[PDB]
Amino acid sequence: GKKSAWATVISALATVISALATVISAWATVG
Amino acid sequence: GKKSAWATVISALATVISALATVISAWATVG
Amino acid sequence: GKKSAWATVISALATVISALATVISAWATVG
Amino acid sequence: GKKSAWATVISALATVISALATVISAWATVG
Amino acid sequence: GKKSAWATVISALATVISALATVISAWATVG
Amino acid sequence: GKKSAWATVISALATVISALATVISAWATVG
Amino acid sequence: GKKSAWATVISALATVISALATVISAWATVG
Amino acid sequence: GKKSAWATVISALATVISALATVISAWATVG
């Protein structure tokens, strides 16, 4: 249970960081 | 260039799957 | 248990896609 | 370039955080 | 430098291949 | 099944450590 | 520098865990 | 079974590539 809760929090963090990586990668593509 | 454009697309796909992983991990957390 | 296993599969999929994005981004960095 | 290198760093961060979520989910799967 | 950038590319390749092994192992775990 | 789950845990550990190496290598590339 | 030295150490650790993962995955493959 | 066999092969490949990444990272550290 607690391990799945931590996995959930970290997956949400990964989702945010992956979105940021996507935006910076688009910036590099046109920059 | 094209490599950065591919990295952008695949990062976005990673973001999509990570958001789904977050939801399924929350589902596992509640049982 | 089965729900946690499915969450693991989907999280691992997100990880592999993010890693592919990373290798392509690094290849662009050296390219 | 510098922008592509930064994109690589942030994408690699997303990959490590997603991998952490994956290892924690697998550990939850085994108990 | 160029050597550090190449090291990043090869390390990212190792990470993607390891992630592929992980996703295939998790998929085997669920069936 | 249980053996495959343990194999998944150890593979995911390898993946997270390799990803950490990748992010540090990329950070050196921009550093 | 120190960042590349850390990347070297952690890549070696990733190699160690990946070899163990290979052995445990073969163990799972045979049952 | 077959999935675990593929995971074993890919883990061995990841082990080799991670070792190569370690060597190139050491080369960057002293190079």
Q: Tell me which of A3, A4, A20, A30 to substitute to probe the interface with D (most D C-beta atoms closer than 10 Å).
A: A3
Q: D28, A4 in Cβ contact below 8 A?
A: yes
Q: How far is CA F18 from the centre of its chain?
A: 4
Write down the experimental method used for this entry. Answer: X-ray
* Ramachandran angles phi, psi of C19, nearest 5°: -65, -40
D vs F: CB pairs below 8 A: 59
Q: Is E11 on the interface with G (CB under 8 A)?
A: yes
Helix C2-30 × helix D2-30 angle, to 10°: 160
Q: Is the dihedral of CA G10, E15, E21, G30 positive or negative?
A: negative
Q: Tell me which of B18, B29, B30 to substitute to probe the interface with C (most C C-beta atoms closer than 10 Å).
A: B18
The Cα angle at residue C29 between residues C27 and C31, in degrees rounded to 5:
65
Provide the 3-class DSSP secondary structure of residue A7: helix
Find the residue in F nearest to G31 (Cα): F3
Domain boundaries, chain C: 1-31
How far does E21 lie from chain G, in Å, by closest CA? 9
F4, F18, F28: residue with CB nearest H4: F4
E1, E6, E17: residue with CB nearest H17: E17
Give the whole-angstrom CA distance, residue G15 versus residue H19: 6
Q: H7, F6 in Cβ contact below 8 A?
A: no
Q: B22, C11 in Cβ contact below 8 A?
A: no
Count Cβ atoms within 10 A of the Cβ of residue G9 and give its class: 0-12 exposed, 13-18 middle, 19 or more buried: middle
User: H1: how many CB neighbours lie within 10 A of its CB?
Assistant: 11
Cα atoms found within 13 Å of the Cα of residue E2, Cβ hemisphere only: 1
For chain E, give the secondary structure using H, E and C: CHHHHHHHHHHHHHHHHHHHHHHHHHHHHHC
